[PDB]
């Protein structure tokens, strides 16, 4: 029984077709019957390896941003790591600039002017300016009068981190607006609440639109560290930029302490719980697929990225009662990748090059991959690459008594051109 199925070119297969079809002047060589005629031959095998499937001639590796780094590599009872990624751009500074502008010095006036402009003349100083501090203490209801001097002299990220939960004075002019009362009244609220359900629409839109199972669609192409600054001949610059790149309060704030460690200080070392360095302030990503930019190569993308393997797995899903064979000369002896495909995911009882007697005792183990009187197999899938039907008939001569033909085709590729000349020859 003869059947034929024709398939559309998939997206990655078509883009590989176009990028290796361009060249300089190909003049459509493979469909100019160069395979029929007898460099041209290199283009012919390139077009064949593209037109079958990508992973039969190069591996689809991981999807990662390009690491713009100069990390410690190797030439190839524990192996240890230190994070040593640096940008290749080295901005070099003279030592005179640092040692005469940034650091204090006996002939420099950095520390004196710093104190004189930040402490002696700060308008929130209670030692000189009491009434202004008392003015804001009446306004904002602050318990301590040095708090304005503390806020005025603290970096923004650090001031964000040590956020105080202490309530203010109750005689203040800080009158809590109705939106703050609405947010605080639903801070830990159940469902089936009238004010509860009004004030969370993002969680309703999350649960309704199934955002917990969506996939990553974009990854950046290049990822880089901050550009390294390289001052020669000083360790103070090394200490300063190592402290600024890895400030332990900021790094620990974007972190989490391990649980057995929290056991160790809370019970074993007796540290009070509120004196822990605070953690867990890094924002939660939208999904598990959105956590990191590295994308693993998926088995299902191997299944779906081919014009012919998709309909092939559809066909062996449909075909169960008859053991079948594949002409592996559609890619010139490529057993390996189909082997990995059908013992990775589509696992079956299998035999591949006593060998001929194993598949006739029972049809549960299929004959599967052989390179072309063994017609005792129930069927055989011989499909294309035949610009000559002589090898086709000699392959089906080897092949129960019933023979069945399964033909595969891809439109737009060279199979239409060799398989329209050879169609009239049959």
């Amino acid at each position: 029984i003869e059947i034929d199925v024709l398939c559309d070119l998939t997206q990655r297969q078509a883009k590989l077709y176009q990028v290796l079809k361009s060249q300089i002047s190909t003049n459509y060589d493979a469909i100019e019957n160069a395979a029929t005629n007898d460099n041209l031959i290199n283009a012919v095998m390139q077009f064949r390896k593209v037109c079958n499937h990508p992973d039969l001639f190069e591996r689809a590796d991981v999807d990662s941003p390009f690491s713009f780094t100069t990390f410690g590599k190797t030439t190839s009872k524990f192996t240890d790591l230190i994070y040593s990624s640096r940008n290749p751009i080295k901005y070099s500074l003279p030592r005179l600039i640092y040692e005469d502008l940034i650091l204090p010095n006996y002939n420099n006036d950095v520390d004196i002017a710093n104190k004189l402009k930040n402490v002696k003349f700060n308008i929130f100083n209670p030692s000189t300016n009491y009434e202004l501090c008392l003015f804001l203490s009446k306004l904002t209801g602050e318990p301590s009068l040095n708090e304005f001097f503390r806020v005025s002299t603290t970096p923004l990220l650090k001031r964000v981190i040590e956020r105080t939960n202490g309530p203010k004075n109750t005689d203040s002019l800080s009158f809590k607006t109705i939106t703050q009362e609405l947010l605080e009244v639903t801070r830990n609220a159940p469902s089936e609440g009238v004010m509860a359900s009004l004030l969370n629409v993002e969680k309703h839109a999350y649960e309704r639109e199934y955002l917990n199972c969506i996939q990553r669609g974009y990854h950046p192409n290049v990822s880089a560290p901050p550009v390294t600054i390289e001052v020669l001949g000083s360790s103070h610059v090394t200490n300063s930029i190592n402290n600024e790149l890895f400030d332990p309060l900021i790094s620990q704030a974007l972190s989490d302490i391990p649980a057995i460690t929290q056991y160790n200080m809370h019970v074993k070392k007796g540290i009070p719980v509120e004196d822990f360095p605070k953690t867990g302030l890094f924002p939660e990503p939208l999904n598990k697929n959105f956590s990191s930019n590295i994308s693993m190569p998926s088995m299902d993308r191997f299944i779906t990225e081919s014009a012919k393997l998709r309909k092939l797995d559809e066909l062996l899903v449909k075909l169960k009662s008859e053991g079948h064979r594949v002409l592996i000369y559609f890619q010139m002896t490529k057993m390996m990748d189909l082997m990995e495909e059908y013992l990775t995911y589509r696992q079956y009882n299998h035999i591949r090059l006593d060998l001929v007697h194993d598949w006739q005792t029972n049809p549960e183990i299929f004959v599967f991959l052989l390179s072309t009187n063994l017609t005792a197999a129930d069927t055989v899938i011989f499909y294309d690459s035949d610009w000559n039907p002589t090898i086709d008939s000699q392959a089906m001569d080897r092949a129960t008594r019933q023979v069945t033909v399964y033909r595969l085709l891809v439109r737009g590729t060279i199979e239409e051109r060799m398989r329209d000349r050879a169609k009239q020859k049959e």
Binding site: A189, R208, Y210, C213, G217, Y218, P283
Partner: protein
Amino acid sequence: SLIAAHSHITGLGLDENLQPRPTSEGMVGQLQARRAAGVILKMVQNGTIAGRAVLVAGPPSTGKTALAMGVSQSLGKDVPFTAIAGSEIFSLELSKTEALTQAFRKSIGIKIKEETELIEGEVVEIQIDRSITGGHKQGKLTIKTTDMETIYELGNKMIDGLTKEKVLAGDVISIDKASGKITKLGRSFARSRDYDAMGADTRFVQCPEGELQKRKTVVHTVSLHEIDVINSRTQGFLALFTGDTGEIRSEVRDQINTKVAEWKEEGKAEIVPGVLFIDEVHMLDIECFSFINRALEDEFAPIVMMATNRGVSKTRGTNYKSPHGLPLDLLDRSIIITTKSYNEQEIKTILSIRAQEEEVELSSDALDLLTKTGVETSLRYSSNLISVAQQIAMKRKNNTVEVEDVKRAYLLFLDSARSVKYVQENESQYIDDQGNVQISIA
């Protein structure tokens, strides 16, 4: 919710042979425009041609927005229909091309098919283990039914969804794996422990029977712009709601285009093309028209529905004057549906349909007076007078609105032309265009 100016139009009033009925689906008149709008609707429902610009032309008070909104009503649910106006493009955070691109990406939709799993049973035992600071969580949940019992592990999101809307042993809950939703159906065991804090006890439900894990497949619709902004930044889900998304790079656009085509070819996604409707498109700028004429030539571009009420008018940002305010290169791309003014029978049908939708019992002679007023002045004035006349009849305690209510409403409220004559009669009382006025009576 509320009755608006376009409350009555439910469909395009169209038969299956693309021929408009005289009066159906809350519409009347404009038979050729209705047939052309139905042709565009069938084009959208086929969904295989991209970037067909359609322009509607006509005088004001003709039914252009009624035609477009009838297209949106008959278009069916879960297919996108943006209804932007011309003035909304000019922003301080986006560029105009960026705003047009975002409207274009909003108009095109993706029907993601997802495989999910439902569990529903009687909760046996919870074993939430938390760290000292409470940041890291892991637990074991145990749930049974009449048939069988299973022990499941727990993650961070499931534990925090169990904590909020707090679940005790004795409850019947339902969990969807793909969305992570928690639905406490009620309390079944009715346990003897009654803490004095709990005052809200859920209603009794019979504990469920059958297998816990039931396979389920669901489909949800997300537009291209939402996927674009979700992949744009780390916190992109907020930027749907706050709208702080902006000047999004072209890299995420092309990568999401490739990924969308990928999800299309493996069968995960089924793209439904939508309709972008730009009311008062004469309000736009020449740079916007340039981007519009170059933006319809992509595969991810919807059918664009355009409306104008201008004659030969000045194209904005330019010295010259063009038909409909639209330049010639854009006018050549578009295909124009025309609309023509009404007569007394069509206007009578309009106010009858409106007063049916305005729950007003109007007398026949008052209806004739309203039709003469509508032909005399405008359709919108006689549409607006019905609710006022209803209120006046309510003040006199009669349900049926009569002729004297219509005359009192006509005397109390002024239309366009009478107000123009009243301004022209005693123009010194109003502030002149040169800023001159006389505010004293002597």
